[PDB]
Structure formats: C-alpha cells, structure tokens
Short mmCIF file of C-alpha atoms and ligand atoms in Angstrom, two decimals:
data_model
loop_
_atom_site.label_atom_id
_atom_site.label_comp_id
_atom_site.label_asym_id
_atom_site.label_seq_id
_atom_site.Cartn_x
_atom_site.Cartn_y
_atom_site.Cartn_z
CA UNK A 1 0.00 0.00 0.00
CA UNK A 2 1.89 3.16 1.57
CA UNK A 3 4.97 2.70 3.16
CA UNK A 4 5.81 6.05 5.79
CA UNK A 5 9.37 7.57 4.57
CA UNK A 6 10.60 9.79 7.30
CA UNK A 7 11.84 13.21 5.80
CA UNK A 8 12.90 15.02 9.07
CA UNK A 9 15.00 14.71 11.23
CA UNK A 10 13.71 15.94 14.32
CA UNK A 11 10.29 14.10 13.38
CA UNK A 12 11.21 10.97 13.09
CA UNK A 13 13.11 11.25 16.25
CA UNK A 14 9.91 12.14 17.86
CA UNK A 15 7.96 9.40 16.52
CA UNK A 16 10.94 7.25 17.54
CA UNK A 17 11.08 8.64 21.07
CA UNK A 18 6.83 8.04 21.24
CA UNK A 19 7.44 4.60 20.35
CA UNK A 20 10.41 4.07 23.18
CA UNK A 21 8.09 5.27 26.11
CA UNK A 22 5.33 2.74 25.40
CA UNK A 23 8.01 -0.40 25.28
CA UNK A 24 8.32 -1.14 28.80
CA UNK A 25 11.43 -3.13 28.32
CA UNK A 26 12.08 -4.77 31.75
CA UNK A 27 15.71 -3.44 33.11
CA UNK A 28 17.04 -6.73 31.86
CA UNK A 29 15.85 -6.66 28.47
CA UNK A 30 17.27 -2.82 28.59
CA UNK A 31 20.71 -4.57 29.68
CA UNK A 32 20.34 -6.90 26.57
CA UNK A 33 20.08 -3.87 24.20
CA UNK A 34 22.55 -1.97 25.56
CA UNK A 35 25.62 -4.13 25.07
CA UNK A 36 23.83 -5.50 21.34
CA UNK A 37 24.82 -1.90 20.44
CA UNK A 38 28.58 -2.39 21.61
CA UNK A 39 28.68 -5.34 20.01
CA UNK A 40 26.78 -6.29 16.97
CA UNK A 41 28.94 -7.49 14.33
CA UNK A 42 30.80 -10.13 17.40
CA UNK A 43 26.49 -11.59 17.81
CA UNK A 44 25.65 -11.00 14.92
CA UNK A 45 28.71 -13.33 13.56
CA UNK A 46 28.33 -16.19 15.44
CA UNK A 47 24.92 -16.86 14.17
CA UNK A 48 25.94 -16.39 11.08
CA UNK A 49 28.30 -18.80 11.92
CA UNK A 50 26.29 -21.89 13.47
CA UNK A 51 23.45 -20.89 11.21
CA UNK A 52 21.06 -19.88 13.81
CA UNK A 53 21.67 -22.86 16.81
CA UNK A 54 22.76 -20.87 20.11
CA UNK A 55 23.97 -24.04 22.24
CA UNK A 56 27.96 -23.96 21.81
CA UNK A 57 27.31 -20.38 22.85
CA UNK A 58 28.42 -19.04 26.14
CA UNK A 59 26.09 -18.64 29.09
CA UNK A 60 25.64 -15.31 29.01
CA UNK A 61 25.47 -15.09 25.16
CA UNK A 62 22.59 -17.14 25.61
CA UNK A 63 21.18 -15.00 28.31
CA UNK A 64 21.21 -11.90 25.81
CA UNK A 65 19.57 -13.75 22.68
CA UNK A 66 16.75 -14.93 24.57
CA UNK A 67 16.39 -11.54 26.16
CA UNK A 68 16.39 -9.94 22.64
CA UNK A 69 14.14 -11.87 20.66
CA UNK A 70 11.53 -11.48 23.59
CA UNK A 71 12.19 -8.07 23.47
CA UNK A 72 9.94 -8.15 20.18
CA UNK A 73 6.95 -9.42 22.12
CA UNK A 74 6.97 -5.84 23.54
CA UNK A 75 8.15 -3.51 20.27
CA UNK A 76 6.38 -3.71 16.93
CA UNK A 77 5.30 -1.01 14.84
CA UNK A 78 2.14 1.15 14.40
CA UNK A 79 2.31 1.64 10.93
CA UNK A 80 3.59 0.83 7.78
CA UNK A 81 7.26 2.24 7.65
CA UNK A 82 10.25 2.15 5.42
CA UNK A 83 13.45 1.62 7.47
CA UNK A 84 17.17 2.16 6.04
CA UNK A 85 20.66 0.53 6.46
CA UNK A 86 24.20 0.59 4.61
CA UNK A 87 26.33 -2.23 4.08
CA UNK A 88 29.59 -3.21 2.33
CA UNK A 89 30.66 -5.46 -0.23
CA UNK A 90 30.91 -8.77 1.75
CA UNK A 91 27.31 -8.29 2.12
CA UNK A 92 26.43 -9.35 -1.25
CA UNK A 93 28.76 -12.56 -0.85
CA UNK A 94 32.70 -13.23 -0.10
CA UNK A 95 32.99 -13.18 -4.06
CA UNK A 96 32.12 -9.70 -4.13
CA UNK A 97 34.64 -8.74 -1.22
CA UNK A 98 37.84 -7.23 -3.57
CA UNK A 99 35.90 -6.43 -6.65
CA UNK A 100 32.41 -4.82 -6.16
CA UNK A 101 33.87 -1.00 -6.12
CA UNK A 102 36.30 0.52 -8.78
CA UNK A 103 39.75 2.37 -7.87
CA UNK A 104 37.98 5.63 -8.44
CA UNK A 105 34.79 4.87 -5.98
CA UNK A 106 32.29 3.77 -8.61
CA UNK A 107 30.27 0.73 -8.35
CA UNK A 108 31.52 -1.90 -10.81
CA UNK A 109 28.82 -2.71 -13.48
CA UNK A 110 29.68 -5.81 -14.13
CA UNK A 111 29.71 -6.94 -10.54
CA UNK A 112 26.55 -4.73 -10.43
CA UNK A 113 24.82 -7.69 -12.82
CA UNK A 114 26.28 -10.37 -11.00
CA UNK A 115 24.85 -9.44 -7.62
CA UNK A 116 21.78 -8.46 -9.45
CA UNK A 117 21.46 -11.80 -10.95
CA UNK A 118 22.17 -13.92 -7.47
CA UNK A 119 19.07 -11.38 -5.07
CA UNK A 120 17.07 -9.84 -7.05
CA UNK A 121 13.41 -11.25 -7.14
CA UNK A 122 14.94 -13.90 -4.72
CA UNK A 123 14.45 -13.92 -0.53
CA UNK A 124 17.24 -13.75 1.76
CA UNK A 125 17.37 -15.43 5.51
CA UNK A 126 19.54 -13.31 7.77
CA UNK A 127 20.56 -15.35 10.81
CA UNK A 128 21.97 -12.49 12.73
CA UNK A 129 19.47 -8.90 14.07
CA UNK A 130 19.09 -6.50 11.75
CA UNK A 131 19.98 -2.82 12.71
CA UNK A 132 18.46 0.03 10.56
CA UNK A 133 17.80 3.90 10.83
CA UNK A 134 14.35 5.89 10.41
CA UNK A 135 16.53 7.62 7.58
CA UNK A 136 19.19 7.76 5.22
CA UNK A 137 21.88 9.23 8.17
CA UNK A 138 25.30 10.50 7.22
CA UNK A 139 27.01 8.13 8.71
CA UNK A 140 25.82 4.51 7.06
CA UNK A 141 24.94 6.61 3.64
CA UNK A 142 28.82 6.61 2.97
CA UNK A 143 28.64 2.83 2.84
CA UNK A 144 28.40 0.99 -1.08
CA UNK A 145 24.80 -0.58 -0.19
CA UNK A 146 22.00 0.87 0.82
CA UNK A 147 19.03 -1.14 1.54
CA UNK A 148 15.63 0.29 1.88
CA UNK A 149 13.20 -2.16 3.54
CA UNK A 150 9.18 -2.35 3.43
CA UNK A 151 8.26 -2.76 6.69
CA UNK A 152 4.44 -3.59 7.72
CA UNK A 153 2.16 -2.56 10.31
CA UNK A 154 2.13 -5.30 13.62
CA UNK A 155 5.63 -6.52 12.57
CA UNK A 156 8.44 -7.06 15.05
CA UNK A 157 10.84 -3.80 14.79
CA UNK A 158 12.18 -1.50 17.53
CA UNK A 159 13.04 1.80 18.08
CA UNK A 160 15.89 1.00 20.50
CA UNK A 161 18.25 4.30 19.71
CA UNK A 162 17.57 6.37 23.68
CA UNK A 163 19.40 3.82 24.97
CA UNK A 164 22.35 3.01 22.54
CA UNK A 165 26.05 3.52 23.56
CA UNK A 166 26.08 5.32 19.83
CA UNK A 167 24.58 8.65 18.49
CA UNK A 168 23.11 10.10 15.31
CA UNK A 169 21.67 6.41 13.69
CA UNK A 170 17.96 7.34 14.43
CA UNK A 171 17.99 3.05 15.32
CA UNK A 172 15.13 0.78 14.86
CA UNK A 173 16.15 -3.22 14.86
CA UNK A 174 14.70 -6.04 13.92
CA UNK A 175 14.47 -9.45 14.85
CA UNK A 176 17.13 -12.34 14.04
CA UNK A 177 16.16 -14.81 11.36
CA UNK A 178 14.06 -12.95 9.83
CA UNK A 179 13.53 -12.96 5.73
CA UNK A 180 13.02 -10.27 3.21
CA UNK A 181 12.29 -10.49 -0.46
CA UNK A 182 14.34 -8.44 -3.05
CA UNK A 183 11.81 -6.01 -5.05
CA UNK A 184 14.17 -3.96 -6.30
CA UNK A 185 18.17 -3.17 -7.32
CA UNK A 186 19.90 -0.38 -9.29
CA UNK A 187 22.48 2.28 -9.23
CA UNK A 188 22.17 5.85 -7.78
CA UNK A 189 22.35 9.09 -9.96
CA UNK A 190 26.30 9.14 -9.72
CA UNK A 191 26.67 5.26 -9.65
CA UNK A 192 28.66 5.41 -6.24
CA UNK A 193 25.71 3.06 -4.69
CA UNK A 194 23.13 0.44 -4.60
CA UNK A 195 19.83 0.81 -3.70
CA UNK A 196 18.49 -2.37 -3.15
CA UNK A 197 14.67 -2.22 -1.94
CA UNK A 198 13.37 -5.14 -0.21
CA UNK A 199 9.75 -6.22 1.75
CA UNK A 200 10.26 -7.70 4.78
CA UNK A 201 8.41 -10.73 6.45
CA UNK A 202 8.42 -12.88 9.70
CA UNK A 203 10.77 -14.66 11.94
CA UNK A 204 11.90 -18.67 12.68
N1 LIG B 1 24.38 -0.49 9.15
C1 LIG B 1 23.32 0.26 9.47
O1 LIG B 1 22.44 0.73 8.47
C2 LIG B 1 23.06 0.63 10.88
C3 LIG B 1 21.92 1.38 11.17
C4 LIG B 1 21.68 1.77 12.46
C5 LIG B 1 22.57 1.36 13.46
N2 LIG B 1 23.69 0.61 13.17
C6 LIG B 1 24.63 0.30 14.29
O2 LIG B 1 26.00 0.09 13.85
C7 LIG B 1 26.49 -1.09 14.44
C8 LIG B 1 26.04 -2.26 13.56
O3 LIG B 1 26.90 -2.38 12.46
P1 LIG B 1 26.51 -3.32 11.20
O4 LIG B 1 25.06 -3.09 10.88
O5 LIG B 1 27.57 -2.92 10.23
O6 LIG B 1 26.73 -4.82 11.84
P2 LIG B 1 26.25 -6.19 11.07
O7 LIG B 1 26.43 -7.36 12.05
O8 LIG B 1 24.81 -6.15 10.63
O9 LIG B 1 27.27 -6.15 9.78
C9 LIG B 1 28.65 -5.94 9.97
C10 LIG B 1 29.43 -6.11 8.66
O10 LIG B 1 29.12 -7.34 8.01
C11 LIG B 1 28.35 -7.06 6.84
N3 LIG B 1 27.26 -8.04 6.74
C12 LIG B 1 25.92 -7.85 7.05
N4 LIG B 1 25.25 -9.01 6.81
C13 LIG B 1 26.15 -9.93 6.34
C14 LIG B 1 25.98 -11.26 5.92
N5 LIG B 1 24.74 -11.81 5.96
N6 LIG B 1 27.10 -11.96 5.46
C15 LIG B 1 28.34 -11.35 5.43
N7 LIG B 1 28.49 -10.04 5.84
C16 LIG B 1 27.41 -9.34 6.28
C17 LIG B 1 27.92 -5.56 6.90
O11 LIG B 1 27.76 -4.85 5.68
C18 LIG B 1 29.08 -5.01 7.67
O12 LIG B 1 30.21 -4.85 6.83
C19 LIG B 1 25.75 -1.25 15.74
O13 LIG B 1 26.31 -0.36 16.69
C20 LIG B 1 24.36 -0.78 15.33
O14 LIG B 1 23.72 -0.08 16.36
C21 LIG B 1 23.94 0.26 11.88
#
C-alpha cells in the first residue's frame, strides 16, 4: 500500500522517542540492548556462523539472545514504515569482497549484474538482528549498499536508539532470522551506490 518515509529529522526522532516510552522493556531486556549496540557485528557473527543454533554459545550469550528476541513481544510497529541501512561489499557474498567497487569509488557494473542476478526477485534469511535507521543518516549513507526495507504494520521492529552507547543512527532493529524479499536493485544518480529495496516478512 503506503509505506511512511521519514523526511525530518527531528520528526522521526519524535515518533521514535513516542514509540520508546510505550516499550516497557524490563531493566534486563534494557541490559540486553545496551551491550547488542557495543557489540553487533561479534552476535551478529556467530549466528551467522552456526546458522542460527545458540547451544555452543556461552552462558551469558545465551542469556542476551533470549532476552532480545523477547524483546519483540513488547516492540512492533504502528504503521507501515520504510526503514534504512548501509552495508559493504561482503554483504552481497565473499565473491564480491575485492571487486564490487572501482579504484575511483564507482560501483563496478559488471559486478553490479552479477549481484543483481544472485538477489534480485529472490528472498534472503539473515541469521543475525538486523539494525536500521528511520533515515538515510550521514554516517551509514557513505557505505556501497543501501538497503531500503518495506516494513508492515504489527511486525516485530524497535526503536531501540535512547538507549544506545552510539549517536546520530535514528535506530530501529529487527528481529534475528528474519527474511526479506528483493523487489528492487539499481544504481544511484552518480553510480557510487546500490539501492536495493526489499519487503520484509516474519521470523523462525
Ligand atoms: N548499518 C546500518 O544501516 C546501521 C543502522 C543503524 C545502526 N547501526 C549500528 O551500527 C552497528 C552495527 O553495524 P553493522 O550493521 O555494520 O553490523 P552487522 O552485524 O549487521 O554487519 C557488519 C558487517 O558485516 C556485513 N554483513 C551484514 N550481513 C552480512 C551477511 N549476511 N554476510 C556477510 N556479511 C554481512 C555488513 O555490511 C558489515 O560490513 C551497531 O552499533 C548498530 O547499532 C547500523
């Protein structure tokens, strides 16, 4: 139907901030949060890793999984939105690693096809959470991808930036092994970019 796109800053950081007070995130989920933000990419990794199974896992890893994906139970969304997040080239596949971007800063075409051919019109499981931003922000928009996902009404998303150890990502995640189709993929006016646009479904 109608996906909200966030144009303002200082709007969507209310909306955000209207969406954090209703949570109620018990101190321990808060806890759980907290450190996911100071360290992502070493959680996000291992299930990437062991596809998904949290058992070989430390205790306390296994403490702060559980207490994320309940999280969700408490944080979905109101509305229809459209979230946003930047990645780099080993996103697409280890293949892509040393040859998606030119030596000038332009986004291989050839490459461009390949990738093209392997996602689009194809879904993609993510074993790991999935962090986003309410907008396009400066700091992930200087990354080669940039994936704009359909998200629906009642579906599991959170608005957890008020209490991140970072600033200025306008943060909404999403829960781990969760799928998304590929709608869309193309270059950006200066061909610096992807734009991949994706619709996002359920869990596991
Ligand atoms: N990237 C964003 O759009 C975004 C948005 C808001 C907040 N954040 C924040 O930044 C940090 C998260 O960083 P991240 O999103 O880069 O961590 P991540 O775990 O999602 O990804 C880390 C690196 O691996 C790549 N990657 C992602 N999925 C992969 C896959 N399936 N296979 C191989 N490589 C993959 C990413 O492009 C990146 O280079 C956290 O502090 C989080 O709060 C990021």
């Amino acid at each position: 139907n109608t996906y909200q796109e966030f144009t303002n800053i200082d709007q969507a950081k209310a909306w955000g901030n209207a969406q954090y007070k209703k949570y109620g995130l018990s101190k321990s989920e808060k806890e759980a949060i907290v450190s996911y933000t100071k360290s992502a990419s070493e959680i996000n990794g291992k299930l990437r890793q062991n596809k998904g199974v949290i058992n070989g896992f430390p205790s306390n890893l296994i403490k702060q999984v559980e207490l994320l994906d309940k999280s969700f139970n408490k944080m979905k969304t109101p509305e229809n939105i459209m979230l946003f997040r930047g990645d780099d080239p080993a996103y697409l596949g280890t293949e892509f690693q040393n040859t998606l971007l030119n030596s000038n800063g332009t986004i291989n075409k050839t490459a461009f096809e390949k990738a093209k051919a392997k996602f689009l019109n194809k879904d993609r499981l993510e074993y790991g959470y999935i962090s986003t931003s309410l907008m396009n922000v400066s700091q992930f928009a200087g990354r080669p991808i940039i994936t704009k996902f359909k998200v629906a009404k009642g579906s599991k998303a959170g608005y957890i930036d008020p209490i991140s150890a970072f600033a200025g990502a306008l943060e909404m995640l999403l829960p781990r092994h969760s799928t998304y189709h590929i709608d869309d993929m193309r270059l950006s006016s200066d061909g610096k970019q992807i734009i991949i646009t994706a619709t996002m479904m359920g869990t596991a």
